[PDB]
Structure formats: structure tokens, C-alpha cells
Ligand binder design. Sequence first.
Ligand code: NA9
Lengths: 250, 34, 10
Amino acid sequence: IVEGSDAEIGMSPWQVMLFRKSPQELLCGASLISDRWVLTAAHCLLYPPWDKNFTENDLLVRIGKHSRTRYERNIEKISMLEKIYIHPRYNWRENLDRDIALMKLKKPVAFSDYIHPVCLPDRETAASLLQAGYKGRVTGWGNLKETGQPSVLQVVNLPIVERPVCKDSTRIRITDNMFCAGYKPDEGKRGDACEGDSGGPFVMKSPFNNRWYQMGIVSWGEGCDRDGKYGFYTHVFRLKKWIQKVIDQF
Amino acid sequence: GSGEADCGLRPLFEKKSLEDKTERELLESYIDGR
Amino acid sequence: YEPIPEEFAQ
Ligand SMILES: C[C@@H](C(=O)NCc1ccc(C(=N)N)nc1)N(C)C(=O)[C@@H](CC1CCCCC1)NCC(=O)O
């Protein structure tokens, strides 16, 4: 997170950390959607250009954290993966289209004041909130500047941007399963996700029932918090059906 | 519903009627805010 | 990063 601020305790009870066993290091961000399933970006697990191809036993899932490096005894919960599912049509070759993956935990995690699942949007909710100008929130333990890292979970509120503006800001072919967010060059305010925040949740609080819904997943960007450039996120509702399939089928 | 009842309600905030330091920034933008 | 307990390394 660039130009954000320290999150307050229990502010993102669904924030998950993808931790690599060896070497022990932050891999990606992720989110808890139920007591047995975590959602993240597919490029966190598979991305050939960088020789990345992790499997169930290469990593751990850490839920309920605040501090980036400390083992938060009695607060955080470390879980093991039983199965990883990458969207069958994930296009890592061209534009990172369909950058999504689901992870099944070995055992259900118990909720607490720091561990709680976020909601998945439904057609009605996505349509009401997914509008240009409406702000969302991104959280992560990633880099603070493009060129080091935070001690505590960082957070930023960012406005969703009109599809047109998103297209004309890059040479990469944008698709319907993506959306971008960030402040424009002349808006005075700034901020963005960055390396390390990948797979992290972009959420919005419904003004109708007071619940938090995950609308996107930190996917890609060109640099971090660069004027004229924007962050791109996986459109969670668009892939909602593949999510339901996977879950009630396995 | 489209998420196990209870999802999205944070133990330390919504369930106690407390708000975090910047959540109103979001809500103010769901109409015409900036 | 602070080392995490061993009974997790699986
Ligand atoms: C796997 C991703 C990646 O690094 N994601 C991490 C990442 C970086 C920056 C941002 C941001 N909102 N500013 N979000 C996520 N890649 C390779 C990229 O985003 C490419 C951009 C394209 C690579 C080819 C496929 C389309 C994206 N740029 C790297 C960089 O700028 O640091």
C-alpha cells in the first residue's frame, strides 16, 4: 500500500496472509469467505514468466493478523491448504484475465474478534455499488513505494474509475472481468496497491444492510501510485458462478 | 444469503455500533460525495 | 519475519 495508513485492530477480520514456508516470507494477500475457503489472485500461485508455480504444501495461510512480521501468539491462526483451484481460463500469457483462485483449508477456522468472513456480492449488490466515483478499501502488507515495507497492515480508500479512463491509461488489453481504481492526476489525493498486496481484497460497505462485500482482488498495475496510471482488480462478481461451482462441488 | 448469514459484520465494529476512523469516507461517496 | 512454530510446517 502506497500513501495509506495503519489499519486499526479488527478493521479487516477477513484479511489473510499467504505465507511461504521456505524461505519464510510474505507471498500475497488473500481473504476469508467462509470457515473453509480463502480467495486470492491466481498469479500468486501460477505465473511462468517469473517461474512461479506453488502447490498446496509450499505454503501456509495466516488469519487474524495485524503486524507484518511478528508471530501474533493467541491472536493469529495458521492454517494449511488441502486443495488449490485456479480458474481454468486464467490468461497469464496475455493480460492476466481471470486472475482468481480458491484455496480449501485443511480444517475449518474458528471465528473471533479478529477473524471473520467477508461477504461475496450478489447481482443486486454489485450493481448498486460498483459505480465510478464510489470508493472502496484495499488492505495489504506490501511495499510502501514503487522503488521499505510496513510494520503494520496498511489501508487505503480508493475511488472506482470509469472503464474508458482505465482503457486509455495502458497498452494492456482490458477485459470485462477487470476494473480499475485510483485517484486521477488532478484530484490532489493519491494512493495505490503495490507489490506484496497481490491477492488482497478490495471491499465496499453496503449502505443498505451495513455489511462488507469483496468486489475485487488486487491483480496488476504498472508501477505503484504513478500519476496517470491505475490499479486493476479482478471483478469478483463476474466470476461468482465459477466460485459457487467449485465450492458446492468440492 | 449469497454469503453465510453473519458475513460482513465485524466483531469489533458493526456488532457494537462502533465505526472505524475512515468508513464514512466510503459511505459519503455512495451518492455524490468526493 | 519472526519464525512461526514448527507444528505448522506441513
Ligand atoms: C503479476 C503482476 C503484478 O506484478 N502484480 C502485483 C501488483 C503490482 C502493482 C499493482 C498496482 N495496483 N499498482 N498491483 C499489483 N504483473 C506482472 C504486472 O502487474 C505487470 C503488468 C502487466 C504484465 C503482463 C500481464 C498484464 C500486467 N507490471 C509489473 C509492475 O509494474 O511492477
